[PDB]
From a paper:
The FfIBP from Flavobacterium frigoris PS1 exhibits high TH activity and relatively strong recrystallization inhibition activity. The FfIBP structure is composed of parallel β-strands in a helical pattern, which is mainly stabilized by inner hydrophobic interactions and intramolecular hydrogen bonds with long α415. Additionally, the FfIBP has a capping head region that consists of two small turns and β-strands, which contain a disulfide bond. This disulfide bond increases the overall rigidity of the protein and reduces residual movement at the ice-binding site, thereby augmenting TH activity and protein stability.
Based on the CD and MD simulation data, four mutants annotated as FfIBP_CC1 (A101C-A120C), FfIBP_CC2 (S96C-L132C), FfIBP_CC3 (M249C-N270C), and FfIBP_CC4 (G160C-S176C), possibly forming disulfide bonds, were generated. The FfIBP_CC2 is located at the interface between the body domain and the long α-helix (α4). To confirm the disulfide formation, we solved the crystal structures of the FfIBP_CC1, CC2, CC3, and CC4 at 2.0, 2.1, 2.0, and 2.0 Å, respectively. Successful formation of the disulfide bond at the intended location in FfIBP_CC1 and FfIBP_CC4 was confirmed by X-ray crystallography, whereas the rest did not form a disulfide bond. The failure to form a disulfide bond may be due to dihedral angle constraints and the inappropriate distance between the two cysteines. When the RMSD values of alpha carbon mutants were compared with the wildtype, relatively high RMSD values exceeding 0.4 Å were observed around the mutation sites of FfIBP_CC2, FfIBP_CC3, and FfIBP_CC4. In contrast, FfIBP_CC2 exhibited a drastic decrease in the melting temperature by approximately 8.3 °C. The mutation at the Ser96 and Lue132 to cysteines likely distorted the conformation of the residual interactions between the β helical body region and α4, which was vulnerable during thermal melting.
Residue numbers in the entry: 61 to 276
Write the structure that this text describes.
Amino acid sequence: TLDLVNLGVAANFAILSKTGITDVYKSAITGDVGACPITGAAILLKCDEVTGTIFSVDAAGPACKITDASRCTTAVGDMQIAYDNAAGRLNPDFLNLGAGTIGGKTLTPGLYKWTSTLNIPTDITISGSSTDVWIFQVAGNLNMSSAVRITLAGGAQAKNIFWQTAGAVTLGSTSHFEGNILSQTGINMKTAASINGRMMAQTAVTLQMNTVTIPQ
């Protein structure tokens, strides 16, 4: 009975930020990337790093960039509506689960809230049907330590997982993440971390040699 978070046009993006995209070469991104209203010069991605289109609001950015202000603007706007929709959900199923550290848990469908920072220091499973939905509401940061893998079980799909964070996200080196990130600030990945998901930041996305794939 938990409704999907509608991403509108932002659904078309693996990475969408408002202040840019930094990168330690070489990353492997599958899906479109965009930044707005910042200049496309703030996208530090090469053409060989993106399987998809790089969208700029202006004439600056990587050589393969497409200038389309109105699409980037709509996407960022839809990302804000999604962020507010996700943050606005009421009547959580869980509050302060694991007291802000959830290593080793198996997370079943529902609306989860943390009034603090959330840490993921060891492997977790997300377990549910192909139609089940998870919304994780985090009033601080979200941290996941090096080499931590999020596993999906029971038919659970990346496209039906949403992480809403009031603070910054940090995914440790070589970690594997599952789901959509709606961050009010930054999403910062470290050396060889991967995500099956979307990085939607109201500030910047920062990468270090990452694999980023849009959910199927």
